[PDB]
């Protein structure tokens, strides 16, 4: 298990570099998406009033 654990960590951290670029994009996209849904929600709210 300890040999496998060292293997698993090293394999992941290689991959975590590669996928982490795409992860960083995903955080930016999701943050924007909630903000834009807030903009859609606030506008549709306001439209109802107007």
């Amino acid at each position: 298990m300890t040999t496998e654990a060292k293997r698993a960590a090293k394999m992941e951290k290689k991959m975590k570099i590669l996928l982490g670029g795409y992860q960083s994009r995903a955080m930016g996209l999701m943050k924007q998406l909630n903000d834009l849904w807030d903009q859609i929600e606030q506008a549709h709210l306001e439209l109802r009033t107007f």
């Binding site: 298990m1 496998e4 654990a5 293997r7 698993a8 394999m11 992941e12 290689k14 991959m15 590669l18 996928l19 795409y22 992860q23 994009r25 995903a26 996209l29 999701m30 924007q32 998406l33 834009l36 849904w37 903009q39 859609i40 506008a43 549709h44 306001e46 439209l47 107007f50």
Partner: protein
């Protein structure tokens, strides 16, 4: 040990295919944003069209 076996099995697939799948998924978020921005731009235009009806 079997948890590590199942884990290491997952990492094999994830290295090759997960790179491509991340790119495809990140695109899908952009497509959600593109649809949202189109609906937003529809909505913002419609609100301002209403405002021009209000103002006139």
């Amino acid at each position: 040990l079997e948890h590590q076996a199942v884990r290491i099995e997952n990492l094999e697939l994830m290295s090759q295919h997960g790179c491509n799948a991340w790119k495809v998924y990140n695109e899908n978020l952009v497509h959600m944003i593109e649809h949202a921005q189109k609906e937003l731009q529809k909505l913002r235009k419609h609100i301002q069209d209403l405002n021009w009806q209000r103002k006139n």
